[PDB]
Structures are given as C-alpha cells and as structure tokens.
C-alpha cells in the first residue's frame, strides 16, 4: 500500500493519500537504515 | 460567552415542534447563505463571536488579530469561532451578510424591524451613520444581558 | 483513479523527486513515532513522589509520622493543520506553452502542475524544518510577524524549563570563554538514569569554524572539537557524540541526548506535504491546487537540553 | 485558584533529584500527620484551599458552608478540597495542625495570625508559629510552613 | 524600468537555499491571500497601471473604455496583474476586498491609506489599511502590504 509499489492501484483519493503516508514512512525508514553518522 | 454552553444540560430536548427553534446562541453562519461568499479566518483576541471585528496590531513579533469593535475601524462581521484553534471566521464588510447579531442592552425594546443600526465600540448593534445595517426583527433575549437580533449588513454608506 | 484524474498521476510520478527532510539527522531512529491525528491533542499522565519532611525517629510511643506526598502531571501535545495554495497551468493547456527547452509562460510566471507541485513541496519542507528546530513559524528573516500558534507546541530551541547559557558579547570570538559556558551548562544537565545514551550537538557554521582550530601555546593533535567530545563523553558514559551544522541556527549551540525516553518526536502521519482533492478550474488556462501539512508533536523532559546563545554585541 | 492547575503541562517532569520537591500548591494534607486526628468535610463557599475557614450561614434554606476568614470567627484550617463535590476538608482549631499555609503578601519562629481573608500574617488570639521562610509560588501566591496549636488567651 | 519582469537578463544563477524574504519582488503578481470566490476583470490598459489604483477613462467614442492609473473619487478598482503582449490589465473592483502589495508614494502598520491622483497609496476618505512598513525596491519604487476594504469616510 505504497507508491513505491508499481503494482499499487489507488481506487479512490483516500487510498491515494494513505499510500503517500506509507511511502513517506518507508522513505524515512530507508533513510535511517542507509544513514552512517561520522564519529569524531 | 461561548459558542456552546459551558455547563452541561440536565434535560433532553423535545424534537416535536418546528417553529422558533433557531433563536439559539449556537446558531452560526447566516440564515441566507450564498455559495459565492468570501470567507476568511483570523486569530481572535477576546470573544468577538456574533460581533463586528476590527484589525488589532501588536508589537510586531506576532501577526495581526481581530477584536470586537466598530465605528470607523469596522473591518467585517464575525460569524463563527473554533475554540480549539482560536480562529475567528470573518465575513468582510464588502460582502453582504444576513444573520443574528449581538444587540446592545439599552433600549432593546425600542428596536423594531426596519430600523437603522450601527456598530458600537464593542462590536454590538445599536439603534441610530457609516454602516448600512437594518434590523429585520425584534430583540430576542437569551440571557439577562445577552440580546440578539436578525439584521442585514450590506456595506458602508456615505 | 489515475485514469480519471491526471493530477493524482502527476503527483505519484513526481513524489519520488522530493528530497527527504533534514530534521531526520537530528533524531535517532527510535525517537520518531508517527501518530494518526490531523488536528487535536493527545494526553499522557506521569506520577511523582516527594518527601515532605525529615524521617521520624521510632523511639518509645509516637503518633505523628512524617508523610510522603504524591503528585500527578498531565502532558498535552497539540496538533495543527495548515494549508497553502498555488497557481499553475491546466493540463490541456500545456501543449500551447511547450517551448524548445521549457514549458510554461516565462513572461507571466506560470508552470506545469508537476513542476509547480515539486517546488511548493520543497518550500513547505523547508518551513517545517525551521519550525521543528526553532519552534516558530515565520517567513521574515528578522523572525517577526510570526503566526500565532497553540500552546503545547514547542521546538528544540524554544523548549521551556531547559538549561540556558549566554556568552557575553565581549567574548564572542574567545573560544575558551565559549567552552567555559558549555561546561557550566553540561554540569547543570540532569540526565540521571538515562545517561548511557548517544548525545547530539548542533552548531551554526560560524561556531563550527571556531571549533576546528587546535586547542589552546597551542596544543598538538588536540582540537577544540576533540576536547568537547571528551567532555560530553564524560557525562554520557563514553557514548557516541555527534556534531551537526545547520545554517538555520545563528550563534546558537544545542546539546541534547538521543534517547527516546527523555525526548520523543510524535509527528502526525500527515505532517509531510499532501495534495488536496479540490482543484479550482475556470474557462482560462490557470488552475489552483492546495497542499496540506501538519505541525507539532515534540515532547521532551525538562532540564535535558542545553541552549547556548553567543550574544553578538 | 485551583488545587490542580487547569492548564496542562507541556513537558515531562524530571524525577532524578529528591531535594526541595515538595514546594507545590498541590501538596494537600500535612507534613506530619497523626493517625489520631479529627477530620471534617464541609460545603465550600469560594476557594478556601490552604486558608483559615469560618462558618458561613445562608438564609436557612440550605445547610451552612465554610469560607475563608479569620480574626474572631476562625473555626479551622482547610487542607484539601474535592473539586467534583465542592467538599472542603477541615481540621478544627481545637486540633493542632502543621503544614504549608497561605501567607499574606518573615523568619522562622515568628508569630502568625489569620487575617480577614484567611491568610497568615505577622503579628493576638491564635497560636501559630512559622517554621520557615516564605516560598513564592506565584507573583501573588506565597506559602509558608507553620504549626497551629489551638488559640491563645487575650 | 517599471515593467513587472525585468528586461535586463541575469548574470548568475540564483541560490535556491533560503526560504525567507523571497517574495518582496516586483514580479509578485496577485495577492498574498486569494479566495476562489474573487471577481476579476481585464480591461484595455492606458499607460502602465500595474500595482496601482485604476480609474475608468473614456475616449471620443470610436474605441471602448479603458483603465488608467488614478484614484480619488474616480477610483474604480485595483490592478493586480498585467499582460504586456495583449495590454490587458487585471482589475479587482473596489466592491471586492483585496490584500497584497501595492505601490506607495515616496508608514507603520495600522496607518490609513488613500489612493492619490497617480494610483499610489499615501497616508491620510479611507480605502485601505497598512499591514507593514514601506519596502524599497528602487530609488523611487516603494511597495507596501495593504488590505483594501472599499470606501468609507
């Protein structure tokens, strides 16, 4: 249920907004996974 | 002093009659409303509900607000307030309005339909110079100090 | 929906080009937890105990005993919904404005919906980042004419009941004086049980350049930054100390831990910009669209953030 | 004006220290409380919390109430209020009390008496001694630890 | 010199990093806050009345009426946009309230402003109220955020 999923098909506007919220969440999850802070 | 009564009610309401069931302080908006009306919201200083509003300017750190007022400083008429956000819904003086507005508690018995009204310093309607407002009914008393009246405001006059 | 509505399709195909907010660097992965609320408030309850007087000696017979009192505290976090409107070009009207290397009326500052949406989204995200760090909403560089906000809406720089240190104007360029105030603030910090946690430091660029100089006859292999990291490592049980630079700050140093227990960010699941379904249309080629975003959700324990302000004359 | 502040706190409390964490308005009761104390509850007339109370009589249609007061009319000291029921917990003047009480807007060991508004003030007819100095909770709210033991003789 | 979009080209790319104080430019057409229920009219433009109060001007009769910069008792509306290719000025009638940046005569929030003969706002009939201090874009170009609420003495 995210825009990153190509197979996703929004039936209505409400589902479209929910996918946006999921997509933002997955991006920040991905960001922290890829983040590597510089020590010292 | 609030859009909805602060104290709760001890009784259920009777939904049987259909006449004179609109003279309540919680009746927001206007009796006749056009879908082509310009509607604004502003930060509210005080409680300008059902009153004429004017622009209030602070030191400068914060944005302008709207407060109950009239006379030469009249900007519009407040028709609704959201208490959680403190946002006052205002209809500009350039837009026509018809609804129930707060009336001054002085000579309210003398107010009759077809009488000219003007706003006072506190944003309350009074019987008459610069604002075109006419009462369409008589004063209805909701509380010992609260009087409302059906009035139509259609801009400034010469 | 994509077949019926072009704007929905355009946003989905362009949402991936919007950069992530920079605030995410300021918080640990566990410090952020989304909530499902557009506008409103959320409440929590904490319980405290205290000693009223000295203990009573149990000798012989006694009836009057010293008492231990309790107190309740209710914490409320407010949320607010704000909206922006921007003009753009109607989809069917794009073919009459396509050019050799651009699309849109340059003379009238009109753009396609897609490019207009991306630019507006970036500006809003910049506005959100400013609020989270500084706790205020304003567009003037002076910071005046701020939007009036609901109480219980604070940022990292305006959080009350925190340790605040002020560096005198005459010692604006003296790094020793600046480091002196930081230590005084560090001593007054009250981490308590949650001490073995990573710490985070955010400085303005002018401060950062002063830091990288060698520690002071100058020392060797020891910078002011290294001394500071050691000083913070003293009180965090030798945990990682991160330093970030933000142009948003100006002569300000912010030190706070990265533990979810002390400071937690609970933003709405709709904080980031979202298109509205309402699109104004007319006989002309100009259309309007709306973007919504939600603010608020920062919660922190008292006397757990150090705020150093370097007065500039 | 309220035992529990109406405005919700914006921040969590820090609970790692253990010193000087009792100077709050919501500290009901007493510092040293005996299990053999006589406790009453009355209808409240106003906000007599942490103040000297006196008996107030209406027109006889309803029962009597207690209001902030002192002088020759003192009846006891209010130490707690239940806001839902408007009940004021009162310890009679015949029973000695020690706790934090409202102070008129002072060194330990000074003699205190209740004023017209039920507030302690420096000195006549009441045995009250201040055990500490004034703690300022608000620009107009001052409290003080005091011991009240009966009434004196004129 | 006075056109909405400068004719002189820019030498360097702008730095799109900051987000503050980037709207006090003369190219900012329209209003800061605009409703979908606003009434807007294009008219033939006589002169360059952009961001000025306009008044109706009549020729001999061969051609239709047009709008020219002006105020006073002849004031009809406020010009918020202009198209140079067609010479059409977008005019919001005085009966409609408008909030935006307007030309100021070469001033603090709360001041009362009335339009002069050249369509420039000036301190005091009252037509608008200043929302900010004068912002200078050129040695003679001063703009000001103002809110128009019709005419009142």
Asked if residue D117 lies in contact with residue D51, where contact means CB atoms within 8 angstroms, the answer is yes
* Closest partner CB to A20 (pick from C24, C240, C274): C274
Nearest to D143 by CA among D135, D151, D132: D135
| Residues of B in Cβ contact (< 8 Å) with C79 | none
CB-CB neighbours of D145 under 10 Å: 23
Q: Do chains D and E touch (3 or more CB pairs under 8 A)?
A: no
The DSSP output letter for E32 is: S
Q: Does C212 touch chain A (CB under 8 A)?
A: no
Those residues whose C-beta lies under 8 Å from the C-beta of residue C58, and which sit 6 or more positions away, are none
Q: For residues A23 and C13, what is the distance between their CA atoms, to the nearest angstrom?
A: 12
Query: Per residue, what are the HEC states of C122-183?
Result: HHHHHHHHHHHHHCCCCCCCCCCCECCCCCCCCCCCCCCCCEEEEECHHHCCCHHHHHHHHH
CA distances from B31 to B38, B98, B102 (A): 16, 6, 15
The minimum CA-CA distance between D60 and chain C, rounded to whole Å, is 39
Cβ contact, residue pair C302, D24, below 8 Å: no
Q: Do chains A and E touch (3 or more CB pairs under 8 A)?
A: no
CA distances from D34 to C26, C98, C233, E133 (A): 53, 89, 49, 68
Among chain A residues, the shortest Cα distance to C2 is held by: A10
Interface test with C, best of D2, D11, D21 (most C CBs within 10 A): D11
Cβ contact, residue pair C25, A35, below 8 Å: yes
Cβ contact, residue pair D32, C53, below 8 Å: yes
Those residues whose C-beta lies under 8 Å from the C-beta of residue D145, and which sit 6 or more positions away, are D31, D98, D99, D100, D130, D131, D132
**DSSP labels, B53-95:** EEEE--SSSB--EEEE--GGG--EEEEEEETTTTEEEEEETTS
Cβ contact, residue pair C274, A31, below 8 Å: no
Interface test with E, best of C108, C133, C284 (most E CBs within 10 A): C108
CB-CB neighbours of C218 under 10 Å: 9
Nearest to C21 by CA among C134, C131, C129, C155: C129
Cβ contact, residue pair B130, E109, below 8 Å: no
**Which E residues, 2 through 61, put their C-beta within 8 Å of a C-beta on chain C?**
5, 17-21, 23, 27, 29-30, 34, 36
Interface A:C, Cβ pairs < 8 A? 49
The minimum CA-CA distance between D116 and chain C, rounded to whole Å, is 29
The minimum CA-CA distance between D69 and chain C, rounded to whole Å, is 27
Residue C66 tokens read as 């010293």
E strands present in chain C:
40-51, 64-66, 68-89, 163-167, 199-203, 241-245, 252-257, 263-265, 274-275, 286-295, 298-300, 306-310
Residue C13, phi then psi, degrees to nearest 5? -75, -15
**Experimentally, how was this structure solved?**
cryo-EM
The minimum CA-CA distance between C121 and chain A, rounded to whole Å, is 13
Q: Roughly how many angstroms between the first and final C-alpha of chain C, as a whole number?
A: 59
CA distances from E30 to A6, C87, E35, E50, E102 (A): 40, 10, 11, 10, 10
Q: Which long-range contacts (CB under 8 A, 24 or more apart) does A11-16 make?
A: A11/C1, A12/C1, A13/C1, A13/C5, A13/C8, A13/C277, A15/C1, A16/C1, A16/C8, A16/C12
Cβ contact, residue pair C138, E23, below 8 Å: no
The minimum CA-CA distance between D64 and chain C, rounded to whole Å, is 31
Angle ∠(D49,D50,D53) on CA atoms, nearest 5: 75
CB-CB neighbours of A27 under 10 Å: 19
Cβ contact, residue pair C107, E20, below 8 Å: no
Residues of C with CB under 8 A from a CB of D: 43, 46, 48, 50-53, 56, 63-67, 69, 71-76, 151-152, 154, 159-161, 190-193, 299-304
Question: Side-chain half-sphere of D69: how many Cα atoms within 13 Å?
Answer: 14
Interface test with C, best of D8, D19, D23, D146 (most C CBs within 10 A): D8
E strands present in D40-85:
40-43, 52-56, 65-68, 74-82
Q: For residues C172 and B80, what is the distance between their CA atoms, to the nearest angstrom?
A: 51
* Closest partner CB to C150 (pick from B60, B61, B85): B85
Tokens 């809406």, located at residue: C153
Q: Roughly how many angstroms between the first and final C-alpha of chain A, as a whole number?
A: 40
β-strand pairing of E75-83 with E121-123: unpaired
E87 Rama class: left (phi>0) / alpha (psi -120 to 50) / beta = left
Q: Does B85 touch chain C (CB under 8 A)?
A: yes
Q: Does A36 touch chain C (CB under 8 A)?
A: no
Q: Does B71 touch chain E (CB under 8 A)?
A: no
Residues of C with CB under 8 A from a CB of E: 85, 87, 106-109, 123, 126-127, 130, 138-141, 145, 247, 280, 288
Please, which chains are in contact with C (at least 3 CB pairs closer than 8 A)?
A: A, B, D, E
Q: Does B94 touch chain E (CB under 8 A)?
A: yes
């Amino acid at each position: 249920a995210s825009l990153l999923d190509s197979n996703f098909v929004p039936i209505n506007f409400t589902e479209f907004v929910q996918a946006i919220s999921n997509t933002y969440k997955q991006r920040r999850i991905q960001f922290y996974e890829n983040l590597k802070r510089h020590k010292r | 002093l609030m859009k909805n009564p602060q104290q709760d009610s001890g009784l259920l309401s009777n939904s049987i009659d259909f006449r004179d069931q609109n003279l309540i302080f919680s009746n927001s908006g206007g009796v006749c409303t056009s879908s082509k009306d310009k509607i604004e919201n502003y930060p509210a200083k005080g409680y300008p509900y059902k009153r004429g509003v004017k622009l209030s300017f602070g030191d400068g750190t914060t944005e302008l607000e709207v407060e109950a007022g009239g006379g030469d400083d009249l900007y519009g008429v407040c028709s609704d307030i959201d208490e959680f956000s403190g946002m006052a819904t205002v209809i500009p003086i350039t837009n026509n309005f018809t609804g129930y507005l707060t009336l001054k508690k002085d000579g309210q018995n003398g107010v009759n339909p077809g009488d000219k009204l003007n706003f006072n310093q506190h944003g309350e309607l009074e019987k008459v110079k610069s604002v075109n407002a006419i009462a369409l009914s008589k004063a209805h008393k909701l509380t010992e100090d609260l009087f409302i009246v059906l009035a139509s405001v259609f801009g400034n006059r010469a | 929906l994509f077949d019926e509505n072009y704007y929905a399709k355009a946003v989905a195909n362009i949402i991936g080009e919007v950069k992530d907010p920079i605030m995410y660097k300021w918080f640990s992965p566990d410090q952020i937890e989304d909530v499902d609320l557009q506008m409103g408030y959320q409440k929590t309850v904490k319980w405290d105990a205290f000693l009223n007087a000295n203990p009573t000696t149990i000798a012989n017979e006694v009836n009057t005993i010293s008492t231990i009192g309790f107190s309740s505290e209710v914490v409320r976090l407010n949320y607010l919904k704000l909206q922006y409107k921007f003009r753009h070009l109607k989809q069917t009207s794009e073919k009459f404005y396509t050019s050799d290397s651009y699309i849109g009326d340059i003379n009238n500052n009109l753009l396609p919906f897609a490019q207009a949406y991306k630019l507006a989204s970036s500006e809003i995200i910049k506005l959100i980042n400013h609020f989270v760090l500084t706790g205020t909403v304003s567009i003037q560089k002076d910071g005046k004419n701020q939007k009036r906000l609901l109480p219980n809406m604070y940022g990292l720089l305006n959080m009350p009941e925190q340790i605040k240190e002020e560096v005198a104007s005459g010692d604006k360029d003296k790094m020793d004086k600046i480091f002196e105030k930081i230590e005084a603030g560090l001593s007054k910090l009250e981490l308590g049980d949650e001490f073995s946690t990573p710490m985070m430091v955010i400085v303005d660029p002018a401060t950062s350049l002063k830091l990288v100089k060698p520690y002071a006859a100058a020392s060797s292999c020891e910078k002011w930054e290294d001394v500071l990291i050691q000083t913070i490592k003293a009180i965090n049980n030798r945990e990682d100390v991160y330093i970030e630079t933000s142009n948003l700050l100006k002569h300000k140093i912010l030190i706070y831990p990265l533990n979810s227990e002390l400071i937690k960010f609970k933003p709405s699941k709709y904080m980031l910009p979202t298109p509205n379904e309402q699109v104004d249309k007319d006989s002309t080629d100009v259309a309007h669209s709306y973007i919504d975003f939600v603010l608020g959700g920062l919660l922190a324990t008292r006397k757990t953030i150090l705020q150093v302000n370097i007065k500039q004359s």
